[PDB]
Structure 1
């Protein structure tokens, strides 16, 4: 098995630029990795204080005085015990899938492979992180690995859900970078239509009161101004923390600020 670590070009991910201009690994090598984790810093104050306290406890000697206790009680095991458990599990068990697990996995593969088509058609450029049959076999392997922990002789939907969630956290998150704006040929008319629609919406709707997506579609599209990409325009306006809020199961669109 291969465990690899690397940095992007320019050092940081530089979320302002395209994903293809940030990852120098070709599609040939990136298809052989079951899980890819893109790691970023969020610079939050609470997390920074928690990490600072955790790191200072390590240096001042307060680490060991805690750790042994948990390793004693019920929550941690030593390296040698975990090594012996790993070797016992690998030499004793080799689980198998159930008929319902295959049905749940096939639909997830179809969904995650459909999404890539819409993303590639919208961005009019090929995806840097690929989704292939190896990505289905990876989820199968993760399901069986999860089953291996409990020495279970069969893998079921309980393990399938966790494997799917891990795959969504690892690879689908990396694929779905969702660029706010790249100023490329894709959405070229949108470069002005975004401001046009923002002005039309902010003149129609004062700082109070709300509207609906149904009305904001029907009436603003009867004039043939539809672009099929306005789904994320509302979210981008929401990102300003003032223009748009979504409430009531996403039905209600509320004007909250300038």
Structure 2
């Protein structure tokens, strides 16, 4: 079935969202063994000791520290895109819609999942968020590349699951 066939609502609602995630039950033994082991470590208390040791190590932070950091980042920083990073965004945004254009002309049917100007503003928002991560007043190309990586991992694989959006 199409991704819009699985949802019990209009396909425009998917376009209202900035990023979509299709969560899959892959059903692999080497994966469910690991998941079950992780849940056992949750239940015994080994995960509690591991997380405390990792917080003391310095590669995880507390939830209250995260809350205060989120408040500080939202109240202090609001980045702006650099002029050199806009060309990459425009080019890699127009290539996707060119691919969807040729897919729609070949298939002669509208794709159930769309990508619009709202998705371009979504990728802009992701780039500005990644720039706001390090309290950076300006967004560089390394934020743009990572934002595009998240967009490919989130909305574009969902579009590829749509066989109108694939091909």
CA distance in 1, matches of 2:65, 2:76: 16
CA distance in 1, matches of 2:156, 2:87: 20
CA distance in 2, matches of 1:137, 1:176: 21
- Considering fraction of residues, name the structure with more helix: 2
RMSD, aligned CA: 2.9
Q: By how many angstroms is 1:138 displaced?
A: 0.4
Bigger RCO (CA 8 Å, 6+ sep):
2
Q: Deviations over 1:56-101 (max 9, x none)?
A: 1111222212211101111111111011011111111111111111
Matched with 2:21 is 37
- Change in Cα spacing, 1:23 to 1:121, as seen in structure 2 (3 Å) is farther
Larger Rg: 1
- Change in Cα spacing, 1:180 to 1:55, as seen in structure 2 (3 Å) is farther
CA distance in 1, matches of 2:35, 2:69: 31
CA distance in 1, matches of 2:11, 2:33: 39
CA distance in 2, matches of 1:161, 1:149: 15
Q: Runs of 4 or more off by more than 4 Å in structure 1?
A: 178-182
- Change in Cα spacing, 1:63 to 1:107, as seen in structure 2 (3 Å) is same
Q: By how many angstroms is 1:53 displaced?
A: 0.8
CA distance in 2, matches of 1:42, 1:80: 34
Unaligned ranges ≥5, structure 2: none
- Residues 113, 165 of structure 2: 8 Å contact kept: no
Q: Deviations over 1:33-68 (max 9, x none)?
A: 100001111111211111111111111222212211
Q: Deviations over 1:7-37 (max 9, x none)?
A: xxxxxxxxxx334432333233222210000
The two structures have a TM-score, normalised by structure 2, of 0.92
Q: By how many angstroms is 1:179 displaced?
A: 4.2
The two structures have a TM-score, normalised by structure 1, of 0.61
